[PDB]
Each structure stands twice: as C-alpha cells, then as structure tokens.
C-alpha cells in the first residue's frame, strides 16, 4: 500500500493557462484562485472515475475540509505499489489535460469568431460612412458651383455639417473628391483594440500539486 | 505521554503585509482577506498531514496528529504528538510545527515570485495593448491631417479661416490652413499620446509591483 | 455533577454594530453577515477548546466539554462541565462561558484595530492613485500646449473648449479630482470616528 497527498495546482503550474483565459476573456476571465478550484475538481472527479473502473483511493483527510486530498494504491511491493500509484496519478493528469486542450480550442474559436464579427461590422459601417459622405460632398459641390462659393466662407465650424458641406467652397470640395481614395476610414478606439485582442488570441499554442509524493 | 497544541488561521494583523502584496498584484481581482487566511492555514495543515503520513512510516512510527478541535467545524485545529518523556513530547511537537512553519515559508516565497511574474505579465500586456491603441489613434489623426493639407493647398488657404473655433473633423480640418496643418506633420513625432485614466493607474500599479505567518496559536503545546 | 448548556452564533441584532463597522471599513468587500456570525462563534469555540485542553491537564483535572448538538456545524454547540456539587457545576459552567466570552472580546478589539488599519491604508492607496492620475492628466494637457506653441509660431501670435488641434488659436500661453475622490476621503473620517461601542448566544442556559 502506497499513499500520496495532492492539492490544487499552484499558480506557477497554471500561469500559462490563466494567461490564456485572460487574453481571451479579460475583465471577465475567471480568477486564478477560482480556477485552481476548478482544475483540482476536475482531477478528483476523474481520479474517482479511474477508481470505479478498477472495481485506488480518493478522500480528503483532514476530515471536514475539501482540500487537501489523500490518495493510495494497494500493490504487491513497496517499489511495486509506489510507482503503480505514481503512474495512475500522472495518467489522470493527462486525461484532464486532454480535456483542457479540447476546451481552450472551443474557447479560442468562439473568441476568434466574436472578435472577427465585431471587426467586420466596424469595417462595414466605416465604409458606408465614408461613402455616404462622398455622396454628400459630390452633391454639395453642385450646390456650391451654382452659387459661386468657390472658396471657404465659414465664420465658424459648428455651421458645417452634412447638409451644409458647400460652405467649404467648390475648390476644397473638388479636392476631397479628387483625393477620395486616400481619405482614411474612421475607426473606433474599440476597433483598434478588438483588432489587437484578435492578434494576441491567435498566438496561443499541471492539474494537481504533490504535497507528498507516494510512499514506500 | 501526549503533547497538545491548538492552532488556527493567522489573524488580519499578521498577514497584512502579505495581504498587502496580493492587493498590489491583483486588482479587485485579489481575494478577500478572509479567503487568504483560509489558504494559509490550509497550506500549513497540508504540509502537516504530509509530516504525519511519513512519521507513521518508519521502522518505528511516531504518531503525529491533526484534526478539527471541535467536530463539524473546519475552523480550529488540534495537533498532538506522542512522546517518551513529558518535556520530550512537548519540545518535539513544537519543533515539528516550526519545521512545517519553515517548509511552508519556503513554498510561499516561491509562489510569491510566481504570482508577481503573472500579475506583471498580466499588466505589461494591458499596457502594450493600450500603447498600440493610442499610437494608431494618433497615426490615423495624422493621415487625416496629411489629407486635409492637400485640400487646403488646392484651395490656396494658408491661414486660419475661422474666428470661433470649436472641434474639428476630416472635412473642416483644412480651415486651419496649410501653414498650420504642415507644421503639425512636421511635429507629429512629438504630438503627445492620449490615454485612458486606466492607463495611468495600470502604469503606477506596475511601478508598485517592483517593491510569513501560516498560523496562530490558540494554545501552545503542553 | 454534570451541568450542560447550548450556545450558538450571535443573532444579527446582536452584531448590528460590529457588522456596520466592518461595512464602514470595507464598503462592499465586507463579508456577508452570515460569515461574520460564523467567525465570532468560531473565535469562541477556539478559546473554549483551549480552556478544555488546559483544565484537563491540571494536577487536579477539571472536565469541560464542547461538541455539536445535531448534524450541523453549530447547529448549535453543546458545552458541559462536571462539578463537585450541583450548585457548583451550573455556576462554574456559566462562569467559564463568560470568562471565555471576555477573553474573546479582548481579541476582538485588537482585531478591529487591524481591520480598520486595513480599511484605511487601502483608501489612502486609492487617493494616492487618483492623485497620480490627476497629475498625469495635468502633465499631458501641459504637453498639448507646449506643442500647440510650435504650430502657432507659424505666425498666429494672437487669438482667433480647445483641443489638440485648434489649440492653435492664440499664443500668449502656458490638482482637480473626481467626486469619488471626495467620496473616498469621506469614508475615512466616517471610519476613524468609530469606537468599540456579542460573540455567542444561549439556546439553553446551563442546567443542574
């Protein structure tokens, strides 16, 4: 018979994960502490399932506190039951790992997706805006030609809106049309950061801690 | 002869220094001072369970004990060691507690550099990101300016056309005239970035980052 | 001769004070009432368990006991004392309960001093911080004038809600806080004007 005591993973054992949930989720990513709980929960559940398929021991000790956890195997040698326990633990620390990889993926992908949809709605609005303005500039060039405002007659800038664009004068008005192709699209600060979130996400590529390694 | 001590979670004063750290490192993300009392004492009892597990596993055992003093309460904990002499169950118990109180302090200093590293990556990110957002905000404003300079050149405007002067779009920019728009692109490398107040808080928080007591005795050993 | 009693955590009314006190220090980081109650009776049963540990290790041993009453945590708590006489046993039990209650009240003063220290030197931190933000903003507005200066030395020199761009207009040119700041400041005189003005209650006062 061999015994080990294992508790929730420490931060430097999950930092990589926690940072990943952070990039993706941000001010609503789960607290590191609230994650340690989740992982070690996943371990015991799985370890327990490894025990029922063997009819291995999972229980708290100390008596009335979830953590830590005491585990044991009943073998056929000191050397025998020790490593037999080591190898049934690690193999649970793989199943849960594989379960995470397959969760990270579904979270990245739903992240990716949502950011992309947001980018490509800003990028559509920005275009419909630029174009709408190009139409009102063209129509204002006509009004300004028919009334010979050839140079800007603005007393103050509050007066210049769509619907009063011809105040700018037929000349400058010619110029904004002439150069229509180099007038930048206008994007939110939100656009640039969403875009930067999307970059940081697209660059993303353990479950317990041994308080006592198994015994002789 | 059995020696006996009762230990519980360390109180608020005690671990205020450690509480302080975790408040730096994490925002309103940092755990309640209660939750950190728990983690600390829980940490100790765990290293203690390990000490007892192994004491029971020699040629000659030694019987070290830990269990909730009162049944059905997580909260106060009772430890006992079973010795040969009287005074020699009580110097033994107390040392095995000081032996764990040292081990935990070892585990703790490592976990603290970890926490730092991760609160620090967490932040350098949010700075860099906010740096990029503000530099592109600026560069877009500069392309707008480069653009309106053409409009002004073509309309031969060199000097401000406006008396009362409140807020400017891509259309109205050229009213500042080409002498202003031009020196502006000349001095774009010095136009100051505008940031969210959160940017300054975050920045100080990183500055701050670059700056014991697992338990308390309710009764010493006996 | 065995006397028994049944104690549990203090009622909400009994902790109105202590509870608000924590609320004034901690705002909304302050623990639920339920968690405070459990923490006080928690302090009590520890002091009591330490008395039981010691009375037993006397040359002439006294037997004091504490245990859950039901299937709960407390539930409430059953405490007993075993005495030479009836009168003795009941009286000695009620004398010990109250002695423990007194020791704990005294831990509970240090405790409040600590929480208040925690509450204050978090609030000062938040002012240390709105101040640095407010200075950073003021430094910026100052750079946004130093720049609008280079531009206006394109001969503007005099003066046709400014902004980085139309601050061009003039030349001849060139500490303020959120109300939250005056909110934080006020929750710092509320606290620190706040003094020590129940650690359990009786389901069943000590018996025969």
Curated annotation (Swiss-Prot), chain A:
GO cellular component: plasma membrane
Pathway(s) of this molecule: Bacterial outer membrane biogenesis; lipopolysaccharide biosynthesis
Keyword field: Cell inner membrane, Cell membrane, Lipopolysaccharide biosynthesis, Membrane, Transmembrane, Transmembrane helix
Principal cellular location given in the protein's record: membrane
Coiled-coil blocks: none
Keyword check for Ribosomal protein: no
GO BP annotations, alphabetical order: lipopolysaccharide biosynthetic process
Function: Confers a modal distribution of chain length on the O-antigen component of lipopolysaccharide (LPS). Gives rise to a reduced number of short chain molecules and increases in numbers of longer molecules.
Protein name: Chain length determinant protein
Species whose genome carries this gene: Shigella flexneri
Lineage: Bacteria, Pseudomonadati, Pseudomonadota, Gammaproteobacteria, Enterobacterales
Span within the parent record: 57 to 285 of 325
